[model samples]
Target chain A: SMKDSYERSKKILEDAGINVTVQRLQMANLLLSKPQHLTADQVFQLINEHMPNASRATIFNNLKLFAEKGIVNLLELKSGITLYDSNVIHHHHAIDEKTGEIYDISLDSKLQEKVLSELKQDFKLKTGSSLENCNLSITLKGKKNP
Target chain B: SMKDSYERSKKILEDAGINVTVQRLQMANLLLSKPQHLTADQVFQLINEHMPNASRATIFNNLKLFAEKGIVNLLELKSGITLYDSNVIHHHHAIDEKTGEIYDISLDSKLQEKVLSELKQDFKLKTGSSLENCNLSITLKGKKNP
Candidate 1:
């Protein structure tokens, strides 16, 4: 547990109020250090290198757990793949529809100011009565960009 | 078989550039007459009364086809529930975390003004892009506020 990989994953799981165990620690070690959008199957196979006995179900459940704990971002693309993202930062994905692969892009939300100002728009949005607390996850899909 | 429900639904489907057929029309009615988010299972139940021969496979495939034709909105929520929406316009949803119930909401005007306008001010399009489409879908999961 004193090793760099061990220590690193310990902090991540701990930060999320998650328990530290050999299986979780080892799993977190692989996910935190490697930056890629992966499926539980991929991560299960990746963790398989370090922990051979982990079942596919166990790996996937843990992945779901990590996601619920806010330790990672889970994206279910319309193209029929669930992606587990390492980057928890606010960003949007630009998906290539032909291949179903994803590339992250930051949307520049500044131009709205110009347009709104051109219209001299000063308006506020009332929160719907039905919603109290929430998070927004967005993904944009398009064909190949030149 | 020109029933009242069939006639109403046929026009909706045909106008959306979808082929008008008895099977697709019956499925669309369950979705449109009174709009609601539904899973394939719930959809199966809805149309089974009208089209007793409708199988689970038939229900799902027609739903997918409608989604592809832009006849319906397919919301794959984070809670692992697939919600088929009859309202295909630019809108969003709020889901109940505990029960997976859903409600519709118009986008926050301020947010759309800010984020969307910003992207437009910075627009530089490329030609290889076969498509440029966006569905501003935001899903929030929570219980009803007291």
Candidate 2:
């Protein structure tokens, strides 16, 4: 999985035309080590805790860079704080309003196909246009009280 | 549509227990006046242009408050910039890689059902856990040259 993580980071950076740098590698490593979503401030604190020499600016900029490169997906939750997700694959997220925990949900080809078809139809009906790319996101928010 | 907008904004704020102020009302009006998505900066500029007394902080805070109340949705594109959409209905978006225009595509219940089913199956197979929520988003980067 480490190998896969490194490869994924490399591919994503390369695809985005960013040269793989030490800071980027470290940031990627930090993100891969955890499967949960993280905030920029949290990441900044973690980087400093682990690598004391790491600058907050470096962490912040690299977070933006990775997000721009599509290596990490950013979610601006209802809290107005931005959260980063490492999984770039097609999926959904469930947020526990009470705990602020996020869970990922994946999609299959059948659903993707159906959504694509509906998008095509809706585009035709509303704008008399054809769609080339469609992004579908659904968020469910509620308190998860124990 | 104006009445719908007013009702939606008021309902959202009331539901979140966030006090609705003049600034919030103006910001909501600005958002409802347009059909296109607006970034925080854009919203701030629009607010300042129309209501000189409205501060950037107010706009930012209200946006977060509105999102929490489900009056608005926050989306981050592949470009890493955050965009806000007011269409709370089930729909997808198409990003024009060249012009940076986002087109909305409404999906019927059938498509949503399909996506939900696929999410359930995929989650079970991969993580041995039930699917909680599924958010599917697609962004097509425009080619540099024609």
Candidate 3:
């Protein structure tokens, strides 16, 4: 079931202008299967388990390509480690400082709606024009007592 | 006023286990005063305007160190470009794909609180629970109409 989902998602990425090679497909599957925020190194290690021949450089490039094409979201964690987010939907994450765990949660539309409305109001007031677009992300970090 | 803020921020970073050398201080000042997401090359050029002897290697190291210590946030923007976030507070950004301008917006407390609550609940459901943190970031692609 998951593999089928990966295949379908891969097709969607190709439609979005990404050249999906084996490396890209494999990376996509790994990302979807785990569905966790991961560093490039962690992905490289995981892929190596199945395909030991995969190069780190290839993994890095694929990750960059995926991020650029909006196939995946990249988050820079508190540790300066870049973690890849598979869920491309609008949501925020809760970061645990002690254990490096990432939990994804959908943002309340009411809050984002307020932000959008406020920006629209401000744009109209300042420039006598309506706002075109609005994007927001919120990260809540805390210490985990282990 | 900006320089004063920069100096205070630099000292705060040094207190947090980061070495605040001259290069670090200069970079910090540039980031604080100008307030734009910049790549290492862009940072080097700006710093070189004042400190001609600053090496790119040093700039890279400083940026990497600052990112790790939470002094700055790094974003993997379009075209494999890594942009540094100047505002250290809880906020998100919107990138103008056409002009490459970044707009920052402060998040509402209700949104942040809700996400944090959901994540804390999910943290207890997983096995081995290796995830230690999560961060949410959203970006909208610029359109001709928008």
Candidate 4:
């Protein structure tokens, strides 16, 4: 199973047209397997243990590269704090206001579709051109405890 | 007209329990009236010419305070870059990927209501409780643009 997961990660990189590198494999692997929303600083702290000499700049650069290649999603959950979502999948975030931590959640397709439809229609009426993408990144500030 | 605008700015700070100062007036006036999404650097550049010796720290601190009091909104258009929006209202942002600048745009009430309702319902179904707030900040990365 671990071997298959490795192959899948490689496939994802290759399909996205990104070259598989040692830095990428290491950092992307952590992001892929753990699937945690991490800030660059948090990422550096984790990766530094494995690669003691790993440079923060290098890690951050690769994170940007991964995002540009559509391998990850970068979000600013709060001002000046950028968090990286593990993948490009359509999911949402829930932040505990009291804790300042982030949790991932999913919105139902039915609601997602209805919102996009209404946005497209309203936008076209206002500007005489259809909106091509209605990407709604919903991050709730706080919610009921699990 | 000038007198009324100044009075309103003073009133805002006074209501927020912030002491009115010349530097605060200079910075907050542009934010309240112009309502452009400006980075702190941009704000400093604007008020520096007029205030001549405006303290960057003081203006930024007041901006934070204003945001806490629901007077202004701070946004991060690009990761690591914090920008301040002028008002607390229903709107969306468009990042001109070409210019790397952010612009505030409004969505009609009809579309806004429809999407919010759907989101609340979906969230309720998932969590077993109704959502208290559904603040959808739709940021468009690219839309039929160069």
Candidate 5:
């Protein structure tokens, strides 16, 4: 795993205090190399192409660990499918209702700052609760433009 | 309760095969009267006005039963709040980040038909799976203009 993407994956795992391994690095390279919203089974199917040694259970377990460490976001959809989102920064998602393709929607930094401020003020005013750990996740469903 | 809204509420509960208790009718009148996205606590607070005898536990239990009976949608938000929605028709939700108010977004019937058709065809072609009993829920977060 001496490729450029492989090194980035290794470094990411090491920085997260994750015990790096060949298989874990491979999984990381696939997910962390770019923003992806993948299910455990999808990851298994893709990883099996190159590394036939790892089982589905192994990859699923590694994905769980990555979510627990804040390296990825685990999204449990109402459809009974869980998606592992690599981009943990503030954002939303849109799924093409036709093809089930997921797209990440990023909030501009200025807008993010304004939204957070308003959320805090409104939460305190309305509920008398501190908005210390509030997180928002939106998933839009519609047809994609050709 | 000889009000027109009361009749509608009673009819709704009756059609759902739910036993029409005085308090259940009141709860139904508040929620089923219009589309609302409210927490159990909010229901309890508003409901206490007319029926001071019903306890919070009683209201919470009835809300759970309404959700179970498919009369209302139970939305469990990641912020540790559960919302009871009155509108069961296919629709979406948009929460105003500034005011913490939720709004219902209805999808046109024609577009709904097209999306369902496309979803079924795509699901079969891509995953070899039947698209039965599938539902979509979209929640949008942004500032609302006056």
Candidate 6:
């Protein structure tokens, strides 16, 4: 099982042009195994459990590189926390206030297209610059629905 | 009128610890004149009409510095655009998709406090880190009905 996950992780890293250095494979193995969000500190704490010799900086740098290489999504949260998402596909997130649980939100294809086109035209008219990207994060602050 | 406005801008910049550099004064004079959101390119284009000698980099750098000093709030739009909000006080925004209009939304103080406290506690329990800040931006994508 470990070897299979290792091969899968190595393939992912190679495809993303990430150098599979010593601890990177282990880090990638954990992150690429599923689609979830994590922080550098969280990644370090989790990965360090298995690879005891892995350092904080090592995990942090690898995550940064992964995001840069387009294998992971980087979320700049308002609370000043940078969340590295394993799901690289374009989507959004909704956070549950009570539980700190994050759920993925997939926009309807037609609606997303219409919104993007409208935003681009509007932005061009107002700022004279093209809109490159747009993202949305919603927080449900209310208690669980009855 | 100009002198009063200039003095107000100077005091604002001074209080923020931002050096009242040459173009910075002119830039601040415009930004502090009212509450609005703008991009660096928009600021450059607007200010350049009056101060032709101001370089693009000058305005861009000043805006970056202003945000860094907390005099101007920096909003990282999901569209990969950084918007400079003249209103530095905490608030949210609602964007009208059809007209590209942005309206400021102020949460009830009680609600804001409750959300922040709940979020902080949830974050601490989940991540073992304190939540420093939280921001929300909403987009209204539907058409205005009669």
Taking the tens digit of each residue's C-alpha lDDT, what string does model 4 give over A44-90? Answer: 88888887887888887877777665467666543667777774544
Residue by residue across B15-126, what tens digits does model 3's lDDT show? Answer: 3346667777777777755558877778778878988898778877877776654556666544667777675653445455566765553334454335444555555454
Fnat values, candidates in order: 0.41, 0.22, 0.20, 0.20, 0.09, 0.05
Off by over 4 Å in 5: A1-3, A117-128, B1-146
- Model 1 per-residue lDDT tens digits across residues A40-84: 677777888888898778888888788765467666555868777
Ranking by DockQ: 1, 4, 2, 3, 5, 6
Predicted complex 6: CAPRI docking category = incorrect
Instruction: State the lDDT of candidate 6 residue by residue for B1-146, as single tens digits.
Output: 98897887776666455667768888888886889888878778788887898878877788767765556765656577867778654334445445666644334334334444554455555555443323333342333221
Clashing residue pairs, candidate 6? Answer: A133-B79, A134-B78, A134-B79, A135-B78
Candidate with best DockQ: 1
The DockQ for candidate 2, computed on C-alphas, is 0.13
State the lDDT of candidate 1 residue by residue for B30-135, as single tens digits: 7887768888787888888788886778777888889888888877765577778888777766554435566665555776655543332223232224334543
- Tens digits of per-residue lDDT, candidate 2, B114-139, equal 65566556546655555344444443
Residue A102, candidate 6: Cα error in Å is 1.2
Instruction: Give the clashing residue pairs of candidate 4, or none.
Output: none
DockQ of candidates 1 onward, in order? 0.19, 0.13, 0.12, 0.14, 0.07, 0.04
Of candidate 5 chain A, the 10-residue stretch with the lowest lDDT total is: A137-146
lDDT per residue as tens, model 3, A15-123? 7688767777777777766557777888788888877988888888888888888878888764567888888877776666444566675545775666555544444
Model 4, position A60: C-alpha lDDT score: 78
Which residue ranges in model 3 land beyond 4 Å of their true spot?
A: A1-14, A17-20, A77-81, A119-131, A144-146, B1-146
All candidates: CA RMSD in angstroms? 11.7, 12.7, 12.6, 10.8, 13.8, 15.6
Classified by CAPRI criteria, candidate 3 counts as incorrect
| Each prediction's whole-model lDDT (CA) | 0.63, 0.64, 0.63, 0.65, 0.67, 0.63
| Ten residues in sequence with the least summed lDDT for candidate 1 chain A | A115-124
